[PDB]
Amino acid sequence: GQVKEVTSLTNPIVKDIRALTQKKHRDETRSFMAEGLKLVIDALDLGWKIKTLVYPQVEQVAAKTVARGGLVLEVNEKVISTITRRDNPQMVVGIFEQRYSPLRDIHPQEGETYVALDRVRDPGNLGTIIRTADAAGASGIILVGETTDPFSLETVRATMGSVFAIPIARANTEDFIRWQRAAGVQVVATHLAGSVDYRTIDYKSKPVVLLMGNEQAGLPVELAREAGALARIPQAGRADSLNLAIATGIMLFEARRHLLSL
């Protein structure tokens, strides 16, 4: 690794970072950006691999970076707010390697809760669910099919750091169904048609996978057939008009209700 200074937007290295706004670029580098000195520090203690740092504590992190084998760019106020796209930005920004837990290395144990999200499309929702799942003590997030990107700048930010702290797995629909069948789990799916009251469900017998549907479409029948129980949250009309993050939060706090205490 090495240190190097930059003040030009046209600089080769800066073009590469800004290109992480785009999904296709991030996928090819398997990389992503996270803003915040503190967050950068916490990420390192949790075993995240850092590729580039950008900006007194500042100086020992720069040290740790070069030591494991990656770059360090000192920069002007105009560059940092270009790459992070904020008029008034943070002084520090790390570029890390993405990580996904492979689905077949997940073996749910007693007391555990996972949240599986079928074709989640809103980065706000995805990031808020990740944070909430971490607050609630879930052991993992499983992204099923084509979802919005958990490592995009907008999702990461809405995690407030929880992206570093709870594992995330991705799978197509077939592999997910196979994994769930063989995992010995109670799959609780929110799905209006065929439902029981979320509060009457057995969350204690087996590890729980909470299966949530896509914001607009909801779960398809093939996922919904895979469920041990179909959940609804009773509302003041016969409508289900809950934001996906909110419903997901409600479900996490009920499923772990018997496990969370003051």
Interacting residue ranges for its own copies, rule: CB under 8 A: 124, 128, 131-132, 134-137, 160, 162, 196-197, 199, 232-236, 239, 241-243, 245-246, 249-250, 253, 257, 260-262
Report whether 190 belongs to an annotated binding site: yes
Q: Which is nearer to its own copies, 89 or 124 (CB)?
A: 124
| Residue in this structure with the two tokens 């992206």, named with its chain if needed | 163
Report whether 235 belongs to an annotated binding site: yes
Asked if 18 is part of the footprint of Co ion (rule: CB under 5 A), the reply reads no
Q: How far apart are CA 113 and CA 226, in angstroms?
A: 17
Asked if 25 is part of the footprint of Co ion (rule: CB under 5 A), the reply reads yes
Q: Which is nearer to its own copies, 53 or 115 (CB)?
A: 115
Q: CB of residue 235 vs its own copies: minimum separation in angstroms? A: 5
Residue 25 binding target from its own copies, Co ion, none, CB below 5 to 8 Å by type: Co ion
Residue 84: alpha-carbon gap to chain centroid: 19
Instruction: Return contacts of 235-241, CB within 8 angstroms, 24+ apart.
Output: 240/192
Q: CB of residue 220 vs its own copies: minimum separation in angstroms? A: 23
Residue ranges with strand state E in 129-180 = 140-144, 168-171
Q: Please state, as a whole number, how many other Cβ atoms lie within 10 Å of the Cβ of residue 44.
A: 18
Q: Which residue in 169, 188, 163 sits closest to 107, CA to CA? A: 169
Report whether 98 belongs to an annotated binding site: no
Q: Which helix (H) or strand (E) holds 132?
A: helix 123-136
According to DSSP, the β-strands at 31-35 and 140-144 are: unpaired
Asked if 232 is part of the footprint of Co ion (rule: CB under 5 A), the reply reads no
Q: What one-character DSSP code corresponds to residue 144?
A: E
Q: Which is nearer to its own copies, 19 or 250 (CB)?
A: 250
Contacts of 219 (CB under 8 A, 6+ apart): 118, 189, 190, 191, 211, 212, 213
Asked if 64 is part of the footprint of Co ion (rule: CB under 5 A), the reply reads no
Asked if 30 is part of the footprint of Co ion (rule: CB under 5 A), the reply reads no
Q: CB of residue 185 vs its own copies: minimum separation in angstroms? A: 20
Q: CB of residue 177 vs its own copies: minimum separation in angstroms? A: 28
Q: CB of residue 128 vs its own copies: minimum separation in angstroms? A: 5
Report whether 21 belongs to an annotated binding site: no
Residue 249's DSSP bridge partners are none
Annotated binding-site ranges for S-adenosyl-L-methionine:
190, 213, 216, 233, 235, 242
Binding residues: 190, 213, 216, 233, 235, 242
